[PDB]
């Protein structure tokens, strides 16, 4: 059945807060050629015990996880199921991603504006893979260029702003050149100094 | 160190804490929230339209949150009642696209380094609360096991109108007002 399936936590053998977390994490490289599952149990902020598919068994990361790791490794049916979760959870959900999330293409909005400092605002794009370059009369500028980190909007879009400190001349044209997987042709946008 | 891969997903960010008590069930793919499960209404709420085609049994969230409830009680007693350490959150405010007076925009408030995951993210327009135009994400995981959360405020841009993001947490001696000043805080 093609529905997302979850990784499962197992049972442990100014106000005050006590926090617990379980993360069923899947790592994919080269599609489903290389797949790794790392399930983590965290007490407050300390990871206490883990299942890494590259190890193939539970391992306490700290003292508080040793009772669980000892107990869960003694249960052969748990181990076999955990060893199979790379396919039933990671590889299974990856097949759903390939036709939905891994196909989301949002072309960026490229804008050039001052605040001399020239800012190329490359907003609302998906996926993250981007290349933004400045040019002054077809000459590539890098020495005087500073870029923000990649900015995660949260709504499944990214933005990034690339700034260029320039010495404005009369016969000068500044072009922001953006490359992104959702574009067949790279976007080139121009700015000309006026007064 | 961190694991190098092309893609990273959390096919279960499971959260349960004593305060409340509350829980959260989300799936994340490459750092973005795919859906959450409303534990009260027993309902899968998708954060991305293309995923609306799928199903996810809200009972999966409910059973896992109950496993985390037992594990929490178990580790509270095992740790000799060691409680979570309040972490000072880092607040950043920026717009979704370049600012145009006479062109609507969204103001984004990122609250980072959140721990424990109990936070109040309200918006102020010239000093007073805002209700309409507001929305927010769930608590999104970080590899250091703290969270972040992003809040939004859809607006009509004005030269007079000034906006602040008021964040409340136990790691702060008094709330935090982060003024939205468009003088390149993103570019430092």
């Amino acid at each position: 059945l093609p529905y997302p399936q979850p990784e499962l936590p197992y049972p442990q053998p100014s106000p005050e807060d006590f926090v617990y977390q379980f993360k069923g994490m899947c790592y994919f490289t080269n599609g489903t050629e290389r797949v790794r599952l790392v399930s983590r149990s965290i007490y407050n902020r300390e990871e206490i015990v883990r299942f890494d598919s590259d190890v193939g068994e539970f391992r306490a990361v700290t003292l508080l996880g040793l009772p669980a790791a000892e107990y869960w490794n003694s249960q052969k049916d748990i181990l076999e199921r955990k060893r199979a979760a790379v396919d039933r959870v990671c590889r299974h959900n990856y097949q759903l991603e390939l036709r939905t999330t891994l196909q989301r293409r949002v072309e960026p909005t490229v804008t050039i504006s001052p605040s001399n400092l020239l800012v190329c605002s490359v907003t609302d794009f998906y996926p993250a893979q981007i290349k933004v370059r400045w040019f002054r009369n077809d000459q590539e500028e890098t020495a005087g260029v500073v870029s923000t980190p990649l900015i995660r909007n949260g709504d499944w879009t990214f933005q990034i702003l690339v700034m260029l400190e320039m010495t404005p001349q009369r016969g000068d044209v500044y072009t922001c050149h953006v490359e992104h997987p959702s574009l067949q042709s790279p976007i080139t946008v121009e700015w000309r100094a006026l007064e | 160190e961190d694991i190098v891969a092309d893609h990273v997903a959390s096919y279960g960010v499971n959260l349960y804490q004593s305060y409340g008590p509350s829980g959260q069930y989300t799936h994340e793919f490459d750092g973005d929230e795919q859906f959450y499960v409303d534990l009260g209404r027993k309902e899968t709420v998708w954060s991305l339209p293309v995923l609306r085609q799928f199903r996810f049994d809200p009972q999966f969230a409910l059973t896992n949150i109950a496993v985390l409830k037992h594990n929490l009680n178990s580790l509270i007693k095992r740790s000799n009642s060691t409680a979570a350490t309040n972490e000072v959150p880092e607040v950043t405010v920026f717009s979704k696209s370049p600012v145009t007076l006479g062109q609507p925009n969204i103001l984004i408030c990122l609250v980072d380094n959140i721990f424990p995951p109990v936070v109040n993210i309200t918006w102020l327009s010239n000093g007073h609360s805002v209700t309409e135009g507001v929305s927010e994400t769930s608590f999104l995981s970080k590899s250091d096991h703290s969270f972040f959360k992003i809040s939004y405020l859809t607006l009509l841009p004005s030269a007079e109108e000034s906006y602040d993001c008021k964040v409340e947490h136990w790691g702060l001696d008094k709330p935090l007002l982060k003024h939205w000043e468009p003088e390149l805080e993103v570019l430092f």
Epitope: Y3, Q75 | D57, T63, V67
Partner: antibody
């Protein structure tokens, strides 16, 4: 290798209580499946009564139960129990306990049932 | 409380006969279907889950099909060991799991 052995079945007076036992062997109660109770009246079919999660307090009962049944599993003894309250002639059935994946077939298909214990409601 | 309606309530067939059992849900149960066999004096045995997944060991002559409300169990070429009562089971809502009535497969002489 793995099995569920039931006990405590027999005769019971109408209006009185009865606790059935279901001891697990070859495995210990854990996540990824449900520990359930299914009764079957003579010559009739299967009727699901309720499940307890293999790894938590998550207990569900069929609508028709009306709070008469209590499903619990003591981990120290590795035993699943069925408390039956306010019994009537309608309750006469062979009572089975099962290890049922249910919404967890994706994680593991192990389907295991007890031998069944006979419960008779009559004075 | 998803109600399952199993048809027929009983049937008669000989060895080699293609046998079809049918189960009907009062609503869409989205692949949450299992099929059990029950022989006299024995607890049920799982045959198929997820509508059509043959449980391990179960012979290739057994098969499942269907979607939403209509589902079938097909024994391609019947064998003497196949005379027993079959049940469908819905686990789409794990808080209200229900079994279909039952279908006794009987020998024709």
């Amino acid at each position: 290798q793995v099995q569920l052995v039931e006990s405590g079945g027999g005769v019971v007076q109408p209006g009185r209580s009865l606790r059935l036992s279901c001891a697990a062997s070859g495995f210990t109660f854990s996540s990824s499946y449900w520990m359930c109770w299914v009764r079957q009246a003579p010559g009739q079919g299967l009727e699901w009564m309720g499940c307890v999660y293999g790894g938590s307090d998550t207990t569900y009962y069929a609508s028709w139960t009306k709070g008469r049944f209590t499903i619990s599993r003591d981990n120290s003894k590795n035993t699943l129990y069925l408390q039956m309250n306010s019994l009537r002639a309608e309750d006469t059935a062979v009572y089975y306990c099962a290890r049922d994946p249910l919404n967890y077939y994706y994680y593991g298909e192990l389907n295991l049932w007890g031998q069944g214990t006979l419960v008779t409601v009559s004075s | 409380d998803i109600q399952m309606t199993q048809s027929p309530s009983s049937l008669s067939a000989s060895v080699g006969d293609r046998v079809t059992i049918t189960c009907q849900a009062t609503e869409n149960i989205y692949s949450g279907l299992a099929w059990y066999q029950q022989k006299p004096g024995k607890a049920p045995k799982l045959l198929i889950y997820y509508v059509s997944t043959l449980a391990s060991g179960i012979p290739a002559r057994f098969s499942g099909s269907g979607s939403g409300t209509d589902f079938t169990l097909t024994i391609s070429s019947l064998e003497p060991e196949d005379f027993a009562v079959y049940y469908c089971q819905t686990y789409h809502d794990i808080s209200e799991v229900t079994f279909g009535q039952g279908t006794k497969v009987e020998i024709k002489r």
